[PDB]
Design a protein around this ligand. Sequence first.
Ligand SMILES: [Zn+2]
Length: 401
Amino acid sequence: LETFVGDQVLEIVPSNEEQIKNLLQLEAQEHLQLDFWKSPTTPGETAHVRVPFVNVQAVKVFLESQGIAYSIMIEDVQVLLDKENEEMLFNRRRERSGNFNFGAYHTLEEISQEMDNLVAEHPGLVSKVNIGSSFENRPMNVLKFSTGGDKPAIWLDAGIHAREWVTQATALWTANKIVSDYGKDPSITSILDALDIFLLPVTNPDGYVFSQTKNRMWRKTRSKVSGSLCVGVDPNRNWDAGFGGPGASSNPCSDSYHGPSANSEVEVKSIVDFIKSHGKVKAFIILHSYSQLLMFPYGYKCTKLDDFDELSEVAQKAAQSLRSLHGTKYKVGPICSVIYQASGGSIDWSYDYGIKYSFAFELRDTGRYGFLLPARQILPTAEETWLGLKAIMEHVRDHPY
Ligand SMILES: [Zn+2]
């Protein structure tokens, strides 16, 4: 168990090119052990960084010495982690007699158990598909929602980055929501009558197990590198889309390490192979946290893609639908514009492969809790996200290609 007693999350706002260059260096300095929750991008944009207790003063002094403005966003990370653990075990005890509570975080085993129950209770609509195994030999199980036939499909995944807990939780709630509304809501009914939906709730099972058992801040896979005492690759920088280019690190010990080669991670290779074998995937949506962003390609290059106008229109519609429920605001745009240049991303590969409707969601919140989003926000997050997902799915249904 890794503790974060005293760790602080600072919000920094570089105002010029030099301050950014300074922050990028810090981020690149693996030995300082800083954890950038939100990397520096362009002047005027905030960056969030978790600084280990021992280095808090030294980092603050350096910041001030460079005249870099900052503020304490989270006073003590351990405070949040303790509440998370407490609420999690409380729920676990209540589930011993009660029903599965979707408004709570669960273990990988509990998630799998629930996926089997879902298939068991609705055999004519839901089935489990195994697409491979993770590095540590865990099955990559996908839920296939279908009414039958050889239909085109919509791909939806969550949890590629281990610590983004609200994503796996949101994906499981979504699976229950589809089966609950099918045959009731005319929209979800028509979408399913026209397409199959493949949902992968835990895209990085090894990293997830590790974040719950050893380090809550882990984000990468758990693969073993030949010739490095460092572990893992950033699964969202491992795809064949401008692989190895700017916006990724070649340092095995970096949390942004791209891996030895494109598709080197079995978790990623499994997805790529499933998609190539299927041959009729029409939409590819990936869930992450946090920042409240709805993006489309590209991330590896910053030029507008062919379908810019349509994708922009679709994402805007989805963002407005999601906003209606609780007033949550999302930034919309191509990856490079919204965040910055990042290579080897999944939606860039899917789009280049020919899947036009490729989108990535960065869920709640904007920094107050970050990855440690309180369980009470899981339901509000899943409900409003469903509105955005449905809007995209309706468009795919209505626009065959
Ligand atoms: Zn992520």
